[PDB]
Amino acid sequence: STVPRLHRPSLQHFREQFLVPGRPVILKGVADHWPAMQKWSLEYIQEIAGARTVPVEVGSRYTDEEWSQTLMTVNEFISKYIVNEPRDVGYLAQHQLFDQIPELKQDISIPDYCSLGDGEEEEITINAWFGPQGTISPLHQDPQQNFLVQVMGRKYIRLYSPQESGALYPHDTHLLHNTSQVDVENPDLEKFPKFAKAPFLSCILSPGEILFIPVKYWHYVRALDLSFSVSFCWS
Numbered sequence: 633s634t635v636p637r638l639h640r641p642s643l644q645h646f647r648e649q650f651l652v653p654g655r656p657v658i659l660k661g662v663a664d665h666w667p668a669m670q671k672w673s674l675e676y677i678q679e680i681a682g683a684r685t686v687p688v689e690v691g692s693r694y695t696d697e698e699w700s701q702t703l704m705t706v707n708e709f710i711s712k713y714i715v716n717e718p719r720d721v722g723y724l725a726q727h728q729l730f731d732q733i734p735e736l737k738q739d740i741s742i743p744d745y746c747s748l749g750d751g752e753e754e755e756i757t758i759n760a761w762f763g764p765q766g767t768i769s770p771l772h773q774d775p776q777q778n779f780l781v782q783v784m785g786r787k788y789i790r791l792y793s794p795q796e797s798g799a800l801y802p803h804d805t806h807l808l809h810n811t812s813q814v815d816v817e818n819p820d821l822e823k824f825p826k827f828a829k830a831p832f833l834s835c836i837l838s839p840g841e842i843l844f845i846p847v848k849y850w851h852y853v854r855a856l857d858l859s860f861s862v863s864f865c866w867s
């Protein structure tokens with residue numbers, strides 16, 4: 633099935649129908665008037681952030697044995713992994729860019745829905761996810777609520793309830809236990825037969841849309857275009 637899309641639901645409606653039961657939804661009409669939606673382009677990103685050092689994940693998926701993490705400038709990242717026919721997949725993933733570069737923080741807004749949480753606003757973490765077409769974040773689950781805001785490009789996203797965890801074959805080690813052993817888009821059904829029948833939601837997340845990923849919901853993400861998303865991690 634597809635993730636439902638709602639236009640600016642009330643706080644109460646979001647709390648009662650999505651946050652408390654732990655059900656995904658796409659919020660429309662909320663982030664579409666972030667300044668980022670019209671300002672962020674490669675040129676603007678280079679102007680404001682190009683000289684700054686960022687961590688870059690290199691490799692198809694963080695579960696790959698070739699995968700590694702390095703450091704470079706934002707200008708270098710764009711040159712090597714976006715604009716010039718890249719040799720390998722690079723991803724400026726899970727980085728607190730807005731703490732590093734407060735000028736860019738002015739182009740976004742924390743969703744008012746986060747105030748329904750039991751945590752402090754000062755404890756919300758804001759992460760950038762910026763990369764070329766084809767980045768893949770393998771199926772995993774996170775320990776907080778998430779609003780994933782799409783600014784540039786589109787992402788294909790697959791969501792599996794925590795009720796389906798047994799069909800997702802989590803890694804057995806403590807370090808990887810919140811990551812699935814399965815490749816969502818080409819699963820080894822000989823090794824992982826229960827995966828095939830596990831129900832899920834999916835969507836293509838487009839610019840200006842916010843996906844609510846409930847705490848512990850399993851998610852898999854593939855960028856369909858040059859993409860920039862902003863996540864808000866909250867409780």
Ligand SMILES: O=C(O)CNC(=O)C(=O)O
Binds near residue numbers: 768769774778780853
């Ligand atoms: O956007 C991606 O590639 C992956 N995102 C996440 O896992 C997240 O926001 O928690």
Ligand SMILES: [Mn+2]
Binds near residue numbers: 772774851
């Ligand atoms: Mn995640």
